Design a protein around this motif. Structure first.
Motif, PDB file in Angstrom:
ATOM      1  N   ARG A 170      78.079 -31.828  31.180  1.00  0.00           N
ATOM      2  CA  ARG A 170      78.941 -32.777  30.481  1.00  0.00           C
ATOM      3  C   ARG A 170      79.492 -32.100  29.237  1.00  0.00           C
ATOM      4  O   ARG A 170      78.722 -31.755  28.335  1.00  0.00           O
ATOM      5  CB  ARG A 170      78.156 -34.027  30.102  1.00  0.00           C
ATOM      6  N   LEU A 171      80.807 -31.919  29.171  1.00  0.00           N
ATOM      7  CA  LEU A 171      81.383 -31.266  28.006  1.00  0.00           C
ATOM      8  C   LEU A 171      81.437 -32.213  26.818  1.00  0.00           C
ATOM      9  O   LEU A 171      81.663 -33.417  26.960  1.00  0.00           O
ATOM     10  CB  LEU A 171      82.779 -30.724  28.294  1.00  0.00           C
ATOM     11  N   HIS A 193      78.729 -44.559  24.911  1.00  0.00           N
ATOM     12  CA  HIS A 193      78.066 -43.265  25.146  1.00  0.00           C
ATOM     13  C   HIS A 193      79.143 -42.201  25.398  1.00  0.00           C
ATOM     14  O   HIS A 193      80.217 -42.229  24.784  1.00  0.00           O
ATOM     15  CB  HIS A 193      77.021 -43.406  26.250  1.00  0.00           C
ATOM     16  N   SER A 226      80.498 -27.254  26.115  1.00  0.00           N
ATOM     17  CA  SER A 226      79.691 -27.767  27.206  1.00  0.00           C
ATOM     18  C   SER A 226      78.212 -27.710  26.835  1.00  0.00           C
ATOM     19  O   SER A 226      77.825 -27.195  25.784  1.00  0.00           O
ATOM     20  CB  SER A 226      79.954 -26.976  28.482  1.00  0.00           C
ATOM     21  N   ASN A 227      77.374 -28.254  27.714  1.00  0.00           N
ATOM     22  CA  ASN A 227      75.938 -28.290  27.485  1.00  0.00           C
ATOM     23  C   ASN A 227      75.183 -27.292  28.355  1.00  0.00           C
ATOM     24  O   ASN A 227      73.970 -27.435  28.539  1.00  0.00           O
ATOM     25  CB  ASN A 227      75.405 -29.704  27.711  1.00  0.00           C
ATOM     26  N   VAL A 228      75.867 -26.282  28.883  1.00  0.00           N
ATOM     27  CA  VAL A 228      75.233 -25.266  29.712  1.00  0.00           C
ATOM     28  C   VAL A 228      75.124 -23.968  28.929  1.00  0.00           C
ATOM     29  O   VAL A 228      75.930 -23.675  28.040  1.00  0.00           O
ATOM     30  CB  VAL A 228      75.985 -25.030  31.037  1.00  0.00           C
ATOM     31  N   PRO A 257      74.790 -19.771  29.521  1.00  0.00           N
ATOM     32  CA  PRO A 257      74.933 -18.721  30.532  1.00  0.00           C
ATOM     33  C   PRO A 257      73.655 -17.919  30.698  1.00  0.00           C
ATOM     34  O   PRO A 257      72.852 -17.776  29.773  1.00  0.00           O
ATOM     35  CB  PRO A 257      76.066 -17.856  29.973  1.00  0.00           C
ATOM     36  N   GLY A 260      66.338 -32.460  30.069  1.00  0.00           N
ATOM     37  CA  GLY A 260      66.616 -32.495  31.495  1.00  0.00           C
ATOM     38  C   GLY A 260      67.099 -31.190  32.106  1.00  0.00           C
ATOM     39  O   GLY A 260      68.125 -31.187  32.793  1.00  0.00           O
ATOM     40  N   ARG A 299      68.126 -27.900  34.072  1.00  0.00           N
ATOM     41  CA  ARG A 299      68.329 -27.617  35.496  1.00  0.00           C
ATOM     42  C   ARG A 299      69.142 -26.326  35.621  1.00  0.00           C
ATOM     43  O   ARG A 299      69.854 -25.939  34.696  1.00  0.00           O
ATOM     44  CB  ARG A 299      68.993 -28.817  36.208  1.00  0.00           C
ATOM     45  N   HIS A 323      72.024 -23.945  37.655  1.00  0.00           N
ATOM     46  CA  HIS A 323      73.273 -24.098  38.387  1.00  0.00           C
ATOM     47  C   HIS A 323      73.837 -22.740  38.780  1.00  0.00           C
ATOM     48  O   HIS A 323      73.666 -21.754  38.060  1.00  0.00           O
ATOM     49  CB  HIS A 323      74.307 -24.829  37.551  1.00  0.00           C
ATOM     50  N   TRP A 343      75.797 -17.927  36.618  1.00  0.00           N
ATOM     51  CA  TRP A 343      74.765 -18.949  36.601  1.00  0.00           C
ATOM     52  C   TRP A 343      74.864 -19.765  35.322  1.00  0.00           C
ATOM     53  O   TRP A 343      75.532 -19.379  34.359  1.00  0.00           O
ATOM     54  CB  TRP A 343      73.363 -18.343  36.727  1.00  0.00           C
ATOM     55  N   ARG A 372      70.073 -31.569  29.367  1.00  0.00           N
ATOM     56  CA  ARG A 372      70.377 -32.998  29.318  1.00  0.00           C
ATOM     57  C   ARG A 372      69.401 -33.683  28.373  1.00  0.00           C
ATOM     58  O   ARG A 372      68.200 -33.776  28.698  1.00  0.00           O
ATOM     59  CB  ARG A 372      70.313 -33.612  30.714  1.00  0.00           C
ATOM     60  N   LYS A 416      70.817 -45.254  24.072  1.00  0.00           N
ATOM     61  CA  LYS A 416      71.902 -44.394  24.546  1.00  0.00           C
ATOM     62  C   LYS A 416      73.136 -45.198  24.945  1.00  0.00           C
ATOM     63  O   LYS A 416      73.652 -45.071  26.053  1.00  0.00           O
ATOM     64  CB  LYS A 416      71.419 -43.529  25.703  1.00  0.00           C
ATOM     65  N   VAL A 422      75.040 -36.522  20.547  1.00  0.00           N
ATOM     66  CA  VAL A 422      74.521 -35.946  21.782  1.00  0.00           C
ATOM     67  C   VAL A 422      74.678 -34.437  21.677  1.00  0.00           C
ATOM     68  O   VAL A 422      73.849 -33.674  22.186  1.00  0.00           O
ATOM     69  CB  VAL A 422      75.238 -36.505  23.024  1.00  0.00           C
ATOM     70  N   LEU A 423      75.746 -34.002  21.004  1.00  0.00           N
ATOM     71  CA  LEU A 423      75.944 -32.580  20.752  1.00  0.00           C
ATOM     72  C   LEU A 423      74.892 -32.027  19.800  1.00  0.00           C
ATOM     73  O   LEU A 423      74.459 -30.878  19.959  1.00  0.00           O
ATOM     74  CB  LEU A 423      77.348 -32.338  20.200  1.00  0.00           C
ATOM     75  N   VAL A 448      71.817 -31.476  21.913  1.00  0.00           N
ATOM     76  CA  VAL A 448      71.957 -30.277  22.738  1.00  0.00           C
ATOM     77  C   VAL A 448      71.757 -29.019  21.894  1.00  0.00           C
ATOM     78  O   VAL A 448      71.072 -28.071  22.310  1.00  0.00           O
ATOM     79  CB  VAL A 448      73.325 -30.295  23.450  1.00  0.00           C
TER      80      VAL A 448
END
Ligand SMILES: [Mn+2]
Lengths: 471, 273
Positions: free
Chosen positions: A361-362, A400, B11-13, B15, B173, B175, B177, B184, B189, B215, B223-224, B227
């Motif tokens: 989620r960006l 949210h 984003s929340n990923v 690398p 959360g 995970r 990818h 990758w 989360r 939430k 939320v940022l 993260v």
DNA sequence: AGAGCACCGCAACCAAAT
RNA sequence: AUUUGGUUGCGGUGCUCU
């Protein structure tokens, strides 16, 4: 092993316009009816000039809903965050008139509401509840002048006890039945578009939670009332002239012991200058078809799209130029051959599979969410924002953070940006509500609505292809 | 639409800049309810030992091919085949064993951090060290600034009263990818887990209310920060989430995947980059 | 009768959105 | 069930192994 880092490439999609009255384009569905009006206002005699409304409420709920519809259809003021409701009279807003005939009013008497306490278990009690709610739809459908619209102002004590009944039924297991899906299916065999209106809306005090402000309660009710009585509120502008948008969605069988997944169809196509028309599921799948997995096999794939082209060559009288099959699940190779061998009569096709994602989620460093219409590509993953901050209204009318719509699979003659441009304008066609946009397209939202009601149809009843009866 | 402003989105990923590229198979293995005599805990405690037992093997990363192995000198003496990632990338079944070994790898990484796993929703939640007391963790950011967040707090009621008798543990959360042919991602989360008085979870219905009440007002700035706090907690300084196995490394570069998008501006925000 | 990943359906409660 | 967005919980399916 130095893994190659993914390239995050991004673009934003321009917001589509909807054709309101006199073919005048505007962005927001709320503001385009106040200035111009609904689309069918000058399109002909399809505009409902007089709407006849019936009730299947009890004594108190009918009076509460009637005073709500008289204090709600004459203009509701709104604050800065809620655009006002103009009205539902012959000189304001939708330019249609509500008329409450006293002859088309059924009434749930107190001798019958307590007759559904005599059966022992929870099965027969819910069955008798659906029985009298079907009987008093029948008594409205058999009058010499049936009403154009039926508002079931159901009492609180009936909905609290028989609105959601779960039980055990020996060979079927844990069965969950809903009253709303069992009375939108009984109103469909009698051809009466209905509207359930509980006491939490009609008796809602100002400055109270769990309901909207009365402007949005006016808007989302009366847009659905204007569509369900014939006529169209708005049609989009940037869409093709021969596409045959199909919205296939999978649904479990009724029961905790029956393992299987049947389908739900939604044709969304264009008929002349009337704009988008929403058809779907004239038939019921046979009980021997099923499908053990979540997806669908090849004879079902050959029968389904054959009935899609049969519906297209019965209302437009042409073979479709394009068939775009939106679907919730991915495309297995068993069903990819069968949606391609049986689409040999159509020039171009687009097998598209989208689903909202879970963790990715960006975000943004500001206080407001990333916008509606972004197209973030994390290498091979494609993420479309059909929900987010909207630049036309400069507000985020949700809570949210919005979920991305992940494009899980794609195969066809179109690009990715082209079909994700068509998906974002198919998003805005939810006539159930006067909202600016949603998550799923209307092809995948109507066909999550038709298969949930196919679970409550007694086989021999042929379902009807309108968006009115499933809304 | 009056003017186009370029913003940077986050984003929340995370690398994955380096992956384990040798899966040393173990095709002679005593079954799962015996494996405790791995012994051989290395002088370098930075070496982690994931393992699975699938089909009578001991699929691991610990270089089981030679004699002196950190893992299972008794269970798997020298029998190995050294399967590579490159031959396994086209097989859907063997790219599942690899990501499940990586899931056990990050589970073993979050063992010094004392994040307990729920093992049912894939949820790494904090718990307090001592019962009845609050846990607040001090973390170091990427830029060097040190901060501290409550993670296992029992909220006192706002009107100067007794505490609200649900503990709001702060959870993640994580995970894995695949973002390409070899690209990758490591997705974070943020989540909440609500307990009665600590160490005892709430029911299925009350948790659904208490997570929706929290939430729903957590918009796109709170939320940022969670993260960023989670990448700083998984970092603990040295801005690469690293993991060593012995001649192999799983290094997660802890910078959120940014981009640049041109859109018509939003009045009243004016993001300060 | 279990373990694991990857991906789906659907049922309850919230809150009106900075 | 005026309405959408999102959260939470439960279950199902495909594949591999014991
Ligand atoms: Mn409706």
């Amino acid at each position: 092993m130095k893994t190659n880092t993914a390239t995050v490439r991004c673009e934003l999609f321009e917001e589509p316009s909807l054709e309101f009255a006199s073919s005048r384009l505007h962005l927001c569905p709320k503001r385009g009816i106040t200035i111009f009006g609904p689309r069918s206002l000058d399109m002909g005699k399809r505009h409902p000039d007089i709407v006849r409304v019936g009730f299947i409420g009890t004594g108190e709920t009918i009076d509460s809903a009637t005073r709500w519809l008289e204090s709600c259809a004459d203009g509701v003021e709104g604050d800065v965050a809620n655009y006002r409701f103009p009205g539902f009279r012959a000189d304001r807003g939708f330019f249609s008139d509500l008329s409450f005939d006293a002859e088309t009013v059924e009434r749930l008497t107190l001798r019958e509401l307590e007759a559904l306490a005599r059966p022992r278990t929870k099965r027969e009690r819910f069955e008798q509840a659906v029985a009298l709610l079907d009987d008093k739809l029948r008594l409205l459908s058999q009058k010499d002048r049936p009403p154009d619209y039926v508002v079931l102002a159901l009492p609180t004590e009936l909905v609290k006890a028989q609105g959601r009944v779960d039980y055990y039924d020996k060979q079927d297991g844990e069965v969950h039945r809903d009253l709303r899906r069992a009375i939108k299916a009984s109103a469909m065999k009698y051809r009466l578009p209905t509207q359930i209106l509980l006491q939490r809306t009609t008796e809602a005090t100002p400055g109270s939670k769990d309901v909207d402000h009365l402007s949005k309660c006016a808007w989302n009710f009366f847009t659905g009332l204007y569509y369900k009585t014939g006529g169209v509120p708005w049609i989009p502008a940037g869409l093709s002239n021969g596409t045959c948008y199909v919205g296939i969605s999978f649904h479990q069988l009724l029961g905790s012991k029956n393992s299987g997944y049947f389908t739900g169809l939604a044709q969304a196509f264009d008929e002349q200058g009337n704009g988008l028309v929403l058809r779907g599921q004239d038939f019921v799948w046979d009980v021997g078809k099923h499908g053990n997995s979540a997806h669908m096999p090849a004879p079902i794939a050959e029968e389904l799209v054959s009935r899609v082209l049969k519906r297209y060559r019965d209302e437009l009288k042409q073979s479709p130029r394009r068939v775009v099959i939106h679907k919730t699940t991915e495309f297995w190779p068993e069903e990819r051959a069968g949606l391609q061998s049986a689409l040999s009569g159509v020039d171009q096709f687009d097998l598209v599979a989208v689903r909202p994602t879970e963790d990715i989620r960006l975000f943004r460093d500001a206080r407001y969410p990333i916008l509606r219409g972004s197209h973030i590509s994390l290498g091979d993953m494609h993420l479309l924002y059909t929900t987010g901050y909207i630049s036309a209204l400069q507000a985020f009318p949700h809570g949210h953070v919005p979920l991305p719509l992940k494009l899980t699979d794609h195969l066809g003659d179109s690009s990715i940006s082209t079909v994700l441009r068509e998906l974002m304008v198919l998003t805005k066609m939810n006539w159930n509500s006067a909202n600016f946009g949603g998550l799923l397209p209307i092809t995948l939202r109507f066909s999550k609505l038709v298969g949930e009601i196919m679970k409550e149809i007694p086989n021999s009843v042929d379902p009807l292809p309108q968006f009115k009866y499933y809304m | 639409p009056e003017a186009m402003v370029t913003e940077t989105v986050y984003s929340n990923v995370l690398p994955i800049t380096q992956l384990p590229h040798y899966v040393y198979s173990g095709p002679c293995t005593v079954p799962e309810a015996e494996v405790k005599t791995l012994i051989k805990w290395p002088s370098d405690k930075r070496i982690l030992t994931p393992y699975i037992i699938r089909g009578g093997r001991l699929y691991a990363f610990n270089d089981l091919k030679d004699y002196e192995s950190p893992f299972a000198t008794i269970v798997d003496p020298y029998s190995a085949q050294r399967h590579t990632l490159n031959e396994w990338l086209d097989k859907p079944d063997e790219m599942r064993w690899y990501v499940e070994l990586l899931n056990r790898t990050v589970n073993k990484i979050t063992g010094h951090l004392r994040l307990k796993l729920d093992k049912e929703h894939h949820r790494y939640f904090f718990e307090p060290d001592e019962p009845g007391k609050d846990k607040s963790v001090t973390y170091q950011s990427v830029g060097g600034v040190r901060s501290e967040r409550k993670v296992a707090w029992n909220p006192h009621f706002k009107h100067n009263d007794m505490p609200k008798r649900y503990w709001e543990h702060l959870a993640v959360g994580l995970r894995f990818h695949r973002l390409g042919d070899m690209a990758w991602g490591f997705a974070i989360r943020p989540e909440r887990r609500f307990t009665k008085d600590g160490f005892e979870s709430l029911e299925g219905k009350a948790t659904g209310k208490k997570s929706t009440k929290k939430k729903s007002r957590m918009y796109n700035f709170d939320v940022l920060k969670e993260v960023q706090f989670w990448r700083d907690f998984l970092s603990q300084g040295n801005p690469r989430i690293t993991c060593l196995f012995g001649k192999q490394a799983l290094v997660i570069d802890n910078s959120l995947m940014s981009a640049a998008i041109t859109w018509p501006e939003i009045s009243g925000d004016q993001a300060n980059r």
